[PDB]
Amino acid sequence: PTIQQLVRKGRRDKISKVKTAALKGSPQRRGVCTRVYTTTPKKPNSALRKVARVKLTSQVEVTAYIPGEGHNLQEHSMVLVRGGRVKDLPGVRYKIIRGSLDTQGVKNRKQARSRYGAKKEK
Amino acid sequence: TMTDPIADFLTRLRNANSAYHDEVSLPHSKLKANIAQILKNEGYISDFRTEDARVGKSLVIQLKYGPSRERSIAGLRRVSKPGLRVYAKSTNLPRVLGGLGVAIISTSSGLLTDRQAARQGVGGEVLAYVW
RNA sequence: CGGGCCUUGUACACACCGCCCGUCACGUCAUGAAAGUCGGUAACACCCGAAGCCAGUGGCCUAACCCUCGGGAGGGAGCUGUCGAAGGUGGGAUCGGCGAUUGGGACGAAGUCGUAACAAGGUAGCCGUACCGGAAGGUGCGGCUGGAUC
RNA sequence: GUCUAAUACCGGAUAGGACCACGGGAUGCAUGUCUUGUGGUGGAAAGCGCUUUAGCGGUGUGGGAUGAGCCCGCGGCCUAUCAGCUUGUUGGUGGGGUGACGGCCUACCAAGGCGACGACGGGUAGCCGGCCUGAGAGGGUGUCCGGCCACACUGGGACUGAGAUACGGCCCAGACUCCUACGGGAGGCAGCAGUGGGGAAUAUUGCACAAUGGGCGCAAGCCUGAUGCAGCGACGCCGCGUGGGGGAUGACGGCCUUCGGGUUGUAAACCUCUUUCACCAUCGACGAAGGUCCGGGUUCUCUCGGAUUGACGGUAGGUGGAGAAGAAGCACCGGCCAACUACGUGCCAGCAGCCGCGGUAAUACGUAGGGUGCGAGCGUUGUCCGGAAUUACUGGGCGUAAAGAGCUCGUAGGUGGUUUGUCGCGUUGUUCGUGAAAUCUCACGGCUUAACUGUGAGCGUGCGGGCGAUACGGGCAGACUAGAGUACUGCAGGGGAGACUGGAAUUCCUGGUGUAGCGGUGGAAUGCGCAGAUAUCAGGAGGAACACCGGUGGCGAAGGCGGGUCUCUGGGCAGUAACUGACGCUGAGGAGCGAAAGCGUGGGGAGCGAACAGGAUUAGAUACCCUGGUAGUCCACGCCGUAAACGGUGGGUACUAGGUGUGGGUUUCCUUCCUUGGGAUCCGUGCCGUAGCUAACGCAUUAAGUACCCCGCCUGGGGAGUACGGCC
RNA sequence: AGAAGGGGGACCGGAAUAUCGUGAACACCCUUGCGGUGGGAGCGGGAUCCGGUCGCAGAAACCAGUGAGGAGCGACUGUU
Ligand SMILES: [Mg+2]
Ligand SMILES: [Mg+2]
Ligand SMILES: [Mg+2]
Ligand SMILES: [Mg+2]
Ligand SMILES: [Mg+2]
Ligand SMILES: [Mg+2]
Ligand SMILES: [Mg+2]
Ligand SMILES: [Mg+2]
Ligand SMILES: [Mg+2]
Ligand SMILES: [Mg+2]
Ligand SMILES: [Mg+2]
Ligand SMILES: [Mg+2]
Ligand SMILES: [Mg+2]
Ligand SMILES: [Mg+2]
Ligand SMILES: [Mg+2]
Ligand SMILES: [Mg+2]
Ligand SMILES: [Mg+2]
Ligand SMILES: [Mg+2]
Ligand SMILES: [Mg+2]
Ligand SMILES: [Mg+2]
Ligand SMILES: [Mg+2]
Ligand SMILES: [Mg+2]
Ligand SMILES: [Mg+2]
Ligand SMILES: [Mg+2]
Ligand SMILES: [Mg+2]
Ligand SMILES: [Mg+2]
Ligand SMILES: [Mg+2]
Ligand SMILES: [Mg+2]
Ligand SMILES: [Mg+2]
Ligand SMILES: [Mg+2]
Ligand SMILES: [Mg+2]
Ligand SMILES: [Mg+2]
Ligand SMILES: [Mg+2]
Ligand SMILES: [Mg+2]
Ligand SMILES: [Mg+2]
Ligand SMILES: [Mg+2]
Ligand SMILES: [Mg+2]
Ligand SMILES: [Mg+2]
Ligand SMILES: [Mg+2]
Ligand SMILES: [Mg+2]
Ligand SMILES: [Mg+2]
Ligand SMILES: [Mg+2]
Ligand SMILES: [Mg+2]
Ligand SMILES: [Mg+2]
Ligand SMILES: [Mg+2]
Ligand SMILES: [Mg+2]
Ligand SMILES: [Mg+2]
Ligand SMILES: [Mg+2]
Ligand SMILES: [Mg+2]
Ligand SMILES: [Mg+2]
Ligand SMILES: [Mg+2]
Ligand SMILES: [Mg+2]
Ligand SMILES: [Mg+2]
Ligand SMILES: [Mg+2]
Ligand SMILES: [Mg+2]
Ligand SMILES: [Mg+2]
Ligand SMILES: [Mg+2]
Ligand SMILES: [Mg+2]
Ligand SMILES: [Mg+2]
Ligand SMILES: [Mg+2]
Ligand SMILES: [Mg+2]
Ligand SMILES: [Mg+2]
Ligand SMILES: [Mg+2]
Ligand SMILES: [Mg+2]
Ligand SMILES: [Mg+2]
Ligand SMILES: [Mg+2]
Ligand SMILES: [Mg+2]
Ligand SMILES: [Mg+2]
Ligand SMILES: [Mg+2]
Ligand SMILES: [Mg+2]
Ligand SMILES: [Mg+2]
Ligand SMILES: [Mg+2]
Ligand SMILES: [Mg+2]
Ligand SMILES: [Mg+2]
Ligand SMILES: [Mg+2]
Ligand SMILES: [Mg+2]
Ligand SMILES: [Mg+2]
Ligand SMILES: [Mg+2]
Ligand SMILES: [Mg+2]
Ligand SMILES: [Mg+2]
Ligand SMILES: [Mg+2]
Ligand SMILES: [Mg+2]
Ligand SMILES: [Mg+2]
Ligand SMILES: [Mg+2]
Ligand SMILES: [Mg+2]
C-alpha cells in the first residue's frame, strides 16, 4: 500500500512460534523420567492414558506419552523422548520412543513392528 | 491533486469505453498526443485531434467500436507510476497478453510500442499496457 | 391453555425443556506483583600496577677506533617517570533466577449463587465515563442504532 | 679460565637512484611525477670446488612478476519498550612516528563531527561463491569444496626477519595439571590421530612419500599427519543382484464363504536353460613419454637400448571350475492417500497429522489373510522451504468479516499541472575490462552405465571507463494560467467569543382565600398536611433551559452550534477576470482543537439526579417503580483527552446513465405573458436508481465504480489494549 | 545533597621585564580644571603549569560534618 509506506516500513513476516520446545534443535533427547502415572483425556474420548514427567537433558521438565500397551517405567528409567502431540490430552506434547535404553519394545507386536519397538522373531 | 495525467487520460479512456462514449475530451499535452498516436497506429481508437480551448490545448479522441457494440479495447492499465517507476531493457520487455496486446514504451527514440522497441533494439520506460 | 396463516426480531438449530454471563468452591498449568535474596554483563571513577614499548638517569662493565699509551672515543650492565593488562575500592546502569505473601489468566467436572445478554430476553442493547453492589450487574451524564414508536 | 675459525662481527677506499639547494626538459590531478645538470654531503659485498671448457656464489641498482598493506562507493540481521552521541572527538599548523596517507601520536589554536536516510545502545551472528526450497520473486541456511576474515588455555606486549592472530617462537599477568632436594621449573591437540566429558548422535593412536604442492641442498638426496590413499559408520547419492522360459489336475496348506466356491496363483511341485554378484584357482595392471645408475651422447640435448624403483595391492580387472545354487525386508491400507475382509477386544485396551474411531456386529485398537507403495531400504522425530496470494514487489486488504487515527494544521519525507532550451544524474544503447576456480544449464568424451570427471558454449543479472540518445523521470535557466492563492462586487448561515437583556414554566418565600386532604402506583406504602397542605390569587427571590419558528434544514475540521440586542471575530459560496504564477496534495513524528463523565480552585444551585436512605416488588431485589436526595449538572479559570468521537466509509484529484426533492449564488426565453414559471451552470445536502463493484447486505457522480498521489491501520480467536518498561 | 565515593594540597625555582587581574607616580599632548587621553614605576592579590627539594606525615599545631539503609510518630521552623 503506497509503496513509499513499504519502503519506510517493510513487510515483516509473522513470528513463527517454535512448534517443539524442551529439546532445543534435538530430534530426540533423553530424560530421567520421573513420575509415571495415568491421566484422563478431555470431555469426549473417556479413557486412561499413560504419561510420564520427564526431566529432559535440556534441564527442563515436560510431559510425555507412553505409546503402545504396557511399560516397565516407574521413576528413574533413562528414556528417549521425541516429538508428537496427542490430541486428547492438554499438556502432552512429547512421546517416549519404545525400544531404547530403558524402554523395552512392546511385547507381542507383529504389525508395524518398528514403531513401539520390536525385533522380528526368533 | 492532479497527479499523473497519463493515468488520468487512460482512466478517462477506460470510463468512456465502458460507458460506450463515442468520443472523449481532455487536456492536451504532447505526451498525450503521442500516446494517442500510438493508440491510433496500433489500431485501438479512431481519429483524434485538437480544439482551441479557452486555455491550453484540448485533446479529443474518438473511440472505435466494432460493427455491433463490442469494445475495440478490452481494457488498459497504467504500469509506470509516479509512485513507482518501472523500466525495462530491450532484452526483457513486458509481454502483454502474451503478445496480443501492446505496451507503450518510452525510449530515447521517442514513444514506440513493444514491436518497434524489440526490433529497433532499445528498451526503457513502460508507460502502460493497452490490449 | 393449545393450535393455524402472514409479518418482525433472534447470539436458538439438541431448535426456549434453546442458548448463555459472572463471582464462589475443587483440580492442573502458564504468568504478573512483592519485603528481600542469588547470579550474570558492560562500562565508569579512583588506587595499586607486572611484562612491555616510550621518555629520562646511569659511580659498576667494556674486544672493533684514536691516542699524548696517561687515557680518550663509541657501547653495556644497573636506576626513575608516562602508558599499561590483571587485581582492589566504590557508586550507579542493565539482564536474569528465587521469594513468604498476593493478583489476575487459561483449561478442566455431572459443584454452589443467581439470570446479565440473545425475542420488546421481561427495565431495548451497546460506547465512553463516574459511582455503587456477593456475582453477573445497577444507576447517573452524554452518545449510537449494531433497537423501538407515531 | 684458556683456545679457534668462517658467506658470523667490526674498520676502511671508490660507487647517484639518500639528502639539500639552485636550475632545465617533459607531462596535472593540488599537495605533485619522471629524466637530468651543477655544487656540497653520504652509504655495499665474499668467498666456497674441481677427473684439469665439474661449478656454486656475493654486493650496488633500473624494470617486471607475485604477494601484501591501506583507503573508498555500493550491498548484506533484529530492535526506538535504545534519542542525543562524540573532547583526540571534528579540523588546522609545527613536529614526532609509519613501509605508507592519516589524531596514528604529540604541543598549540578554533569549536567542530555524527544522527530519525536510525547516531549511540541492547540482542544475535563469522562472511561469501554457494546449499535447501520455490514457477519465479522470495524464504531458510553458510555443512563438504573453494575464496576472505578472526582466533590458537584466558588476557596484555614486543623481537628477529622481506614477510608475524608468529597454533607445535619469546616476555608478563591469570586459571588449570605435573616434578622438586621447596630454592625452583615444565605444559597448552580449535595439526594428524586417539582418550575422557556433554549429547540422540558422527570414525582408525594405519601405510606411503608412488604421484602432486611445499621446505632445504650444485646435486644425489632428507623433511612434509600437506597430499595420495587405505579402515569404520546405509551417513547420503548412484549402480547391480538375490534367477529365467515353460509349467494346471489352475495341486496341498492358509484365509474367507451366500458352503455351489473364490483368493494367494504360473505364484508353487516339476522340467529346462544361464551364472551378473558372492566361492575357489590363476595371471595381473594404468596411474611413471617418471626417479636414479651404469652403453652410446658434439658440450646444453637426445635417445638406439640394457638393470632397478607403486602405499594403494596380488587391488581393480581378464580367464577356467561348480551348480538356482549364499543372499529381503520395511511401511501403510476411513478421506487427504494408492491400497479390505475375517476373528480377538468392547470408552477398555488403545490409534491418530487433521476430523475423529472404539460404549457387542470396528474397512480406523491387537492378530490373521489379502493387497498397495517402496525396497537395502522402509518408517518416526526434529529442522527448513512449499502448499500459505496466511506480510501480498511479483501478489492481499481496512462500511458490516481484523483493519480509517476523533478531527485539523503542519515538520521531515513522498508526490506533483502546461510549455521552451540546455545538462545528461536516473533511464536507456553499444563496446572494453571485471564479475576467479569450482557450482547450475547446453553439447559432446571416459571411467562397464550411472553417480563422478573433463572440454567447449551460457551463467556470472552487478560494477567501472569510453562513445551515442533525450521520449519519460531528475537538475538548471525561463514561460503560461488551467491547479493554488490574492483582489473586487455580492450572498447565506443555531460558526465562535464577550457584555447586557426578555418571557413562559418549575421551586421557594411573604401575604389573601379556603378546608382535609395532597402526592404517587400496575396496586400501594414511605412522604407532604391538618401547626393550615394540595388547590387558587397577587407580589417577590433565584437558578437553569431557551417552547411556537424548527425542517428531511443551515453553519462548523471534528467535537459541536439557536430567546433577543449590541460589540468583536472565523470560515464558506457565487460572480468579474484585476493580480501572483505551481506557490499544489499528503503528511511519519509533532502541535492544536476535542461530547459527556471526571479532577482542582472559587462561585452558584431552581429542576433533575450517580451515591445514599426509606417505601414497594420479590425467594432474595445491593435493581427496575415510588418518596426524598449528595456529588454532579450551571458559571470562571485550569486539568483530563476519552465516546457506537459513526457514514463503524482518511485526505486530494479526474472521469463514469439518469430521475426527484431541498439549501446558497450566478446567468438566458415568453419580461412585463410577472411566474417570480422554463432552461443552463457552480457549490452543498437527501432519496431512488444504470453501468461497475460487493460474500451478501448493499454502494452507486456525496461510490463501497474506474484510476493516480500521500498517510493511518490489519495479518485467526482468546490471553490483551493486559503485563513490564517508558511518557503524560 | 556537603548524598555517597574520589583526587590534589608543603617549600624552592622557572614560566613572569606588561603572565594575569587590583589599585595608577615622573615626564608628553588638548574646551585652563579636585579636568581628560595615553603611560607604566614601585605596592599588593590570585590561579595554573613545568621542574626540583625535604619529611613518617604539607588541611600541617589550634580549629574542623561520621556516613548509609529500614520502620514508628509528628509534615515542616518553632513551643513546653
Ligand atoms: Mg388455514
Ligand atoms: Mg482456582
Ligand atoms: Mg516477578
Ligand atoms: Mg619502569
Ligand atoms: Mg510465590
Ligand atoms: Mg435477563
Ligand atoms: Mg441489562
Ligand atoms: Mg425482570
Ligand atoms: Mg434487559
Ligand atoms: Mg453506562
Ligand atoms: Mg444503585
Ligand atoms: Mg442515557
Ligand atoms: Mg683467533
Ligand atoms: Mg668491508
Ligand atoms: Mg664515499
Ligand atoms: Mg648458498
Ligand atoms: Mg591535545
Ligand atoms: Mg598537525
Ligand atoms: Mg607530519
Ligand atoms: Mg557465537
Ligand atoms: Mg509460490
Ligand atoms: Mg568457511
Ligand atoms: Mg565443519
Ligand atoms: Mg582446549
Ligand atoms: Mg623488522
Ligand atoms: Mg604444541
Ligand atoms: Mg583432531
Ligand atoms: Mg553420551
Ligand atoms: Mg613427496
Ligand atoms: Mg576416505
Ligand atoms: Mg555403501
Ligand atoms: Mg544408523
Ligand atoms: Mg540405487
Ligand atoms: Mg569371473
Ligand atoms: Mg486412497
Ligand atoms: Mg467385533
Ligand atoms: Mg490398524
Ligand atoms: Mg513431520
Ligand atoms: Mg508466501
Ligand atoms: Mg507448514
Ligand atoms: Mg485478505
Ligand atoms: Mg480505502
Ligand atoms: Mg470490524
Ligand atoms: Mg473518521
Ligand atoms: Mg489543507
Ligand atoms: Mg497537512
Ligand atoms: Mg514539505
Ligand atoms: Mg521533488
Ligand atoms: Mg511534471
Ligand atoms: Mg560416453
Ligand atoms: Mg558423459
Ligand atoms: Mg561440470
Ligand atoms: Mg564462475
Ligand atoms: Mg482558478
Ligand atoms: Mg454567531
Ligand atoms: Mg414567575
Ligand atoms: Mg430554595
Ligand atoms: Mg400560604
Ligand atoms: Mg400556593
Ligand atoms: Mg505574469
Ligand atoms: Mg500523526
Ligand atoms: Mg485541548
Ligand atoms: Mg462537563
Ligand atoms: Mg468542578
Ligand atoms: Mg471526587
Ligand atoms: Mg465547588
Ligand atoms: Mg430515584
Ligand atoms: Mg432502596
Ligand atoms: Mg463566558
Ligand atoms: Mg479509541
Ligand atoms: Mg456524534
Ligand atoms: Mg475506529
Ligand atoms: Mg477517496
Ligand atoms: Mg449535488
Ligand atoms: Mg441506490
Ligand atoms: Mg467492499
Ligand atoms: Mg493470536
Ligand atoms: Mg493500559
Ligand atoms: Mg506502567
Ligand atoms: Mg563528601
Ligand atoms: Mg611557587
Ligand atoms: Mg611540580
Ligand atoms: Mg620520602
Ligand atoms: Mg515536630
Ligand atoms: Mg533548621
Q: What angle do CA A104, A107, A110 make, to 5 degrees?
A: 120
Q: Is the shortest CB-to-strand distance from B126 to strand D under 7 Å?
A: no
Q: Does A3 touch chain B (CB under 8 A)?
A: yes
**DSSP single-letter state for residue A20:** S
Which of the nucleotides lies closest to B112 (Cα–C1')?
A: D471
Q: For residue A84, give the amino acid letter.
A: G
Q: Is the shortest CB-to-strand distance from A117 to strand D under 7 Å?
A: no
**Letter string b/e over residues A12-39, b meaning 16 or more CB atoms within 10 A of that residue's CB:** eeeeeeeeeebbeeeeebbbebeebeeb
The whole-angstrom separation of Cα B131 and Cα B127 is 13
Which of the nucleotides lies closest to A61 (Cα–C1')?
A: C29
The whole-angstrom separation of Cα B37 and Cα A52 is 80
**B130: enclosing H helix or E strand:** none
**DSSP single-letter state for residue A100:** B
Phi, psi of A42 (to 5 degrees): -75, -165
Taking CA atoms, B35 is separated from B22, B30, B86, in Å, by: 19, 9, 17
Chain B residue with CA closest to A5: the answer is B83
Q: Which residues, at least 6 apart from A54, have a Cβ–Cβ distance to it below 8 Å? A: A31, A32, A33, A34, A61, A62, A63, A64, A79, A81, A94, A96
The whole-angstrom separation of Cα B27 and Cα B59 is 6
- Method of structure determination: cryo-EM
Chain B residue with CA closest to A1: the answer is B83
**DSSP single-letter state for residue B104:** E
Nucleic strand D contact set for A 27-46 (CB, < 7 Å): 27-31, 38, 44-46
Taking CA atoms, B34 is separated from A54, B28, B91, in Å, by: 77, 10, 24
Give strand pairing partners of B81.
Answer: B84
Declared resolution, Å? 2.3
DSSP-based three-state secondary structure for A39 = strand
* DSSP symbols for B6-57: HHHHHHHHHHHHHTT-SEEEEE--HHHHHHHHHHHHTTSS--EEEE--SSS-
Give strand pairing partners of B57.
Answer: none
The whole-angstrom separation of Cα A69 and Cα A50 is 9
Taking CA atoms, B104 is separated from A41, A57, A122, B35, B129, in Å, by: 67, 66, 80, 8, 6
Q: Is the shortest CB-to-strand distance from A83 to strand C under 7 Å?
A: no
Which triple of cell numbers denotes residue B116?
Answer: 518497434
Report the distance from CA of residue B68 to the C1' of nucleotide D172 in Å, as an integer: 101
What burial class does residue B42 get, using C-beta atoms within 10 Å of its C-beta: 0-12 exposed, 13-18 middle, 19+ buried? Answer: middle
Question: Among candidates A29, A22, A115, A39, which has minimal Cα distance to A78?
Answer: A29
**Residue A45 CA from chain centroid, whole number:** 20
Nucleic strand C contact set for A 103-122 (CB, < 7 Å): none
Q: Which residues, at least 6 apart from A35, have a Cβ–Cβ distance to it below 8 Å? A: A52, A53, A75
Per-residue 3-state assignment (H helix, E strand, C coil) for chain A: CCCHHHHHCCCCCCCCCCCCCCCCCCCCEEECCEEEEEECCCCCCCCCEEEEEEEECCCEEEEEECCCCCCCCCCCCCEEEECCCCCCCCCCCEEECCCECCECCCCCCCCCCCCCCCCCCC
* The dihedral formed by the CA atoms of A56, A96, A93 and A29, expressed in degrees to the nearest 10: 40
Greatest Cα pair distance, chain B, in angstroms, is: 45
Whether A50 and A70 have beta carbons less than 8 Å apart is answered as no
Question: Among candidates A98, A60, A122, A3, which has minimal Cα distance to B81?
Answer: A3
Which triple of cell numbers denotes residue B60?
Answer: 479529443
